[PDB]
Structure 1
């Protein structure tokens, strides 16, 4: 497989939509891997077995699916390329694998669901429930025979890459974004943020995981609109099951209030999405097309509320 040349320069666009090229997404990740880290950074043998076993371990849920992991992975690719100068090979290796893997085996279900009804995984993992599991899956497949793509790493360089991926996967729990984005906002406007400080890198990386994770709000409006169907299809199913017992789900998961969606978008943009890309853009000025595309979509949703 080789990427049809009519992309190449289209893959480098922040707003790039992977949708129409489903049979290609395994080759795009290889492509995004090949371009970034160089080719021979893994054995092409064990990157494919890895890619394809990550794949098959995504469920046929409407949104937290294979298509989404590739959409997050792609967005890390675009962020990295435009920030070539200031990440390391061991980082640009783990972060792309971490993005492809960060929702592994998702069930179409919130952490709040899995705890409010004694779900066994929340018995395992009491905080960051689904995200501690995604990392769990990642480690399993890695250790499966002929799948350790990090075999060509020294001892202390292998346990390094594992840490980055773990941290990045955990940071995709939106409940930790809010504190992390606010810690990041203090330092930059006190002036005290130091990219040499390892723990600051972790915050920065965490936010880059957050920005990638929500990046269907940074696409061209037609694409960003259709993705929203998939997000609510899945919220509405989680609410439908909170309903089956007799419990009224938050209006975000209540299908009986689709009417309320464009308002909830705008507020979600104004409370989650715009602050995140706003911060990422101050740390990483090249990521500003993400912020610009987020504004554009927000005003789109405002026209939807305002009758236009």
Structure 2
């Protein structure tokens, strides 16, 4: 309990900021995550030796895909960490515990394909779960790893708290189904503007947590421009592979996923910043004002994609 994980000076400072990049050294990502749980939750909350065993089994069940990989998991976990430190008093001891775990586990065993492709390919996981196909799979994997021996990081919670925390994680992981984002923000917008939003309503917390989870999942669009620029190549590599697999079933993919239509990427990014990211971070700042820096960084990047279309910058 007297073994405080430290980070080098530049990391120790830069890690507190929303736009932190976790860097290219895979071997430091576990220490970074533990550093974050320790400052976010306490030295007390988790048994160091169980935690480390959990993190490495989680790492082992992420796959080598261009984007939906172990780096993504830790990135998303970091954004949640930033949100929780800048909104210190709003969240319970259990939420702080489960949300950082939820973010680490949110894309467990992803193969780089959307729910749509599972449905058209007729993947057995689509028989098992008709909506949020991958997201009920990710949660299922979380529970598997939670039930390996020496892996129950939650062993000190009562029966109650254990159910509470796994129900935070489940809901938190389902909420990363972007198809659910749209209704979830339209309802929080309406609750904030008519002043009914009330954080003592457990129904309303769930929604707020779902939006944090979209916020964290999308946070590659909230980094400094050269990190956003270089992550997009990873994002489109998965999209273009999925389009190839679509063409393989005898189906024109949407252009986003057609690697013959690379020319339309920047306009496609504009669409997505306008249609998804900017609305996500607007609504999230209205509900939690200290998250503004996510909105500020998102708009800067929108403005950098505008510059790309005007040929004042190439990609």
Report the TM-score, using the length of structure 2 for normalisation.
0.96
Structure 2 gaps of 5+ residues are none
Q: Which string of whole-angstrom CA distances, capped at 9 and with x for unpartnered residues, describes residues 8-56 of structure 1? A: 1210000111133322111110010111111121110100000000001
Deviation of 1:264 (Å): 0.5
Query: What SS is found at the alignment partner of 1:86?
Result: coil
8 Å CA contact 2:106–2:173 kept in 1: the answer is yes
Query: What SS is found at the alignment partner of 2:198?
Result: coil
Deviation of 1:59 (Å): 0.5
Structure 1 CA distance for aligned equivalents of residues 185 and 120 of structure 2? 27
Deviation of 1:262 (Å): 0.2
1:247 is matched with which residue?
Answer: 251
1:53 is matched with which residue?
Answer: 57
Q: Which string of whole-angstrom CA distances, capped at 9 and with x for unpartnered residues, describes residues 132-178 of structure 1? A: 00000000000110000000001101000000000000000000000
Deviation of 1:247 (Å): 1.6
Which consecutive segments of 4 or more residues in structure 1 shift more than 3 A? none
Q: Which string of whole-angstrom CA distances, capped at 9 and with x for unpartnered residues, describes residues 50-71 of structure 1? A: 0000001001011100000101
Deviation of 1:130 (Å): 0.1
Deviation of 1:131 (Å): 0.2
Structure 2 CA distance for aligned equivalents of residues 201 and 21 of structure 1? 36
Deviation of 1:243 (Å): 1.0
Structure 2 CA distance for aligned equivalents of residues 149 and 241 of structure 1? 39
Deviation of 1:5 (Å): 2.8
Cα RMSD after superposing both structures? 0.8
Deviation of 1:100 (Å): 0.3
Mean Cα displacement is larger for which, 46-55 or 2-11? 2-11
Query: What SS is found at the alignment partner of 2:130?
Result: coil
8 Å CA contact 2:211–2:284 kept in 1: the answer is yes
Q: Which string of whole-angstrom CA distances, capped at 9 and with x for unpartnered residues, describes residues 264-302 of structure 1? A: 001100000000000000000000000000000000000
Query: What SS is found at the alignment partner of 2:62?
Result: coil
Structure 1 CA distance for aligned equivalents of residues 194 and 12 of structure 2? 40
8 Å CA contact 2:62–2:70 kept in 1: the answer is yes
Structure 2 CA distance for aligned equivalents of residues 19 and 269 of structure 1? 25
- Corresponding residue pairs, total: 307
Structure 1 gaps of 5+ residues are none
Taking the TM superposition and a 5 Å limit, the aligned residue runs for 1:48-197 are 48-197=52-201
Deviation of 1:7 (Å): 1.5
Deviation of 1:238 (Å): 0.5
Mean Cα displacement is larger for which, 52-61 or 18-27? 18-27
Q: Which string of whole-angstrom CA distances, capped at 9 and with x for unpartnered residues, describes residues 62-99 of structure 1? A: 11000001010000000000000100110000000000
